[PDB]
Amino acid sequence: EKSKSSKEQKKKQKVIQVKEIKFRPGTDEGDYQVKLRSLIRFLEEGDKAKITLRFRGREMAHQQIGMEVLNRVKDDLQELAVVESFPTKIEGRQMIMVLAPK
Amino acid sequence: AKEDNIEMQGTVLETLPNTMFRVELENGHVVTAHISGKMRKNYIRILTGDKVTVELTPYDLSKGRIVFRS
RNA sequence: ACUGACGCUCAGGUGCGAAAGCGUGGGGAGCAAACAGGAUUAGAUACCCUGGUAGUCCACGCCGUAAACGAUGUCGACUUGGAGGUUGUGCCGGCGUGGCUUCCGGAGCUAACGCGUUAAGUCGACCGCCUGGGGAGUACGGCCGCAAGGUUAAAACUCAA
RNA sequence: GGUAUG
Ligand SMILES: C[C@H]1O[C@H](O[C@H]2[C@H](O)[C@@H](O)[C@@H](O)[C@H](O)[C@@H]2O)[C@@H](N)C[C@@H]1NC(=N)C(=O)O
Ligand SMILES: [K+]
Ligand SMILES: [K+]
Ligand SMILES: [K+]
Ligand SMILES: [K+]
Ligand SMILES: [K+]
Ligand SMILES: [Mg+2]
Ligand SMILES: [Mg+2]
Ligand SMILES: [Mg+2]
Ligand SMILES: [Mg+2]
Ligand SMILES: [Mg+2]
Ligand SMILES: [Mg+2]
Ligand SMILES: [Mg+2]
Ligand SMILES: [Mg+2]
Ligand SMILES: [Mg+2]
Ligand SMILES: [Mg+2]
Ligand SMILES: [Mg+2]
């Protein structure tokens, strides 16, 4: 009968979901700031943050311009998140850095 | 009969609206360049990072026409 | 039966004016901006779900705006028809005769769509308004407002729509 | 149940 409150006591600690924010090589400053405010909000709630960077076409041939962005995000989210994964290579046409709450 | 253009080599720093580009030249001056007509019509895409030939004018050394992408 | 042109229109003026909103005080079921949470999602400051405050209601006072629309100013006259609705009335269910109103259509009008005796037809009276797009119903000034704002209302500039 | 992008 009293499973009702047991189920509640289970649910009262949240399951960590993974929120995805997707950048591009040429994401401009103001738009970057919006996405960063998104990530700050996600990590302060205790959610993981699968940050992706999608290359398109011949932007593939300038990988480091992308890598710069992911490095920038890591640095900005340094006193808040910890890098659970950093991309070495372009897998497909993407580079996935998982952050996670401290 | 036209006066001669300085062709200089350079790297695209930013893509601006409407096929305009900041380009750092070899000499180190950052010109605002625009795509050539031939390139526009032949769909040669220019990106941040790309190596480009820039035709320049002595009349204004802040401006140039991107004529080739390597 | 009576009055005997006493009329029509109206800048300024005065009033009325959906909802939201504002002030003071009531009231508060339902609903519900904001908000809280649950989801959905690449993100989802939404749509969906659970709630939920102002508000919605009343009194008094304010506000004065809406696709406040027929996107059609008011008054009068004239100009083929058809089918209805609604509300009087006269006469012998029928035959008239008024008011309001819905739809179709003729001439005519219209860029066309369409309008078409309830005209966007044919005329007359008076008023309001327009003069390329954006800038802008914005700025400045005035007036009004507790405030939100409202009203009156430009220009530079830029475009070749 | 949202048919993001040839
Ligand atoms: C269902 C989505 O519909 C609308 O977005 C459509 C988009 O999803 C594509 O099907 C095409 O680009 C269409 O041309 C767009 O109209 C747009 N209103 C956003 C909606 N999506 C969401 N609300 C959602 O995914 O969530
Ligand atoms: K008068
Ligand atoms: K309430
Ligand atoms: K026609
Ligand atoms: K003009
Ligand atoms: K004013
Ligand atoms: Mg009200
Ligand atoms: Mg009140
Ligand atoms: Mg409710
Ligand atoms: Mg709701
Ligand atoms: Mg108005
Ligand atoms: Mg109406
Ligand atoms: Mg009007
Ligand atoms: Mg009058
Ligand atoms: Mg008709
Ligand atoms: Mg007309
Ligand atoms: Mg104003």
Let me know: does B5 contact B55? Beta carbons within 8 Å. yes
The structure's method of determination equals: cryo-EM
A30 touches chain B (CB under 8 A): no
Task: Classify burial at B28, counting beta carbons within 10 Å of its beta carbon; exposed 0-12, middle 13-18, buried 19 or more.
Answer: exposed
Closest alpha carbon within chain A to B14: A26
Give the largest Cα separation in chain A, rounded: 63
State in Å: Cα B19 to ligand 5 middle.
Answer: 30
Distance, in Å, from the CA atom of A72 to the CA atom of A78, rounded to the nearest integer, reads 10
Closest alpha carbon within chain B to A57: B45
Residues followed by a gap in chain B, C→N > 2.5 Å: none
Per-residue H/E/C for chain B: CCCCCEEEEEEEEEEECCCEEEEEECCCCEEEEEECHHHHHCCCCCCCCCEEEEEEECCEEEEEEEEEEC
Q: How many CB atoms lie within 10 A of CB B13?
A: 13
Q: Would you call A96 helix, strand, or coil by DSSP?
A: strand
∠ CA B23-B24-B26, nearest 5°, is 130
Residue from A42, A53, A28 nearest A77 by CA: A42
Let me know: does A60 contact A15? Beta carbons within 8 Å. no
Listed resolution, Å: 2.4
Q: Would you call A82 helix, strand, or coil by DSSP?
A: strand
Strand A18-23 vs strand B60-69: parallel, antiparallel, or unpaired?
A: unpaired
Sheet holding A48-54, edge to edge: A18-23, A48-54, A94-101, A81-83
Residue from B56, B47, B54, B39 nearest B15 by CA: B47
Q: Who's near B31: CB < 8 A, 6+ residues apart?
A: B10, B22, B23, B25, B54, B56, B61, B62, B63, B64
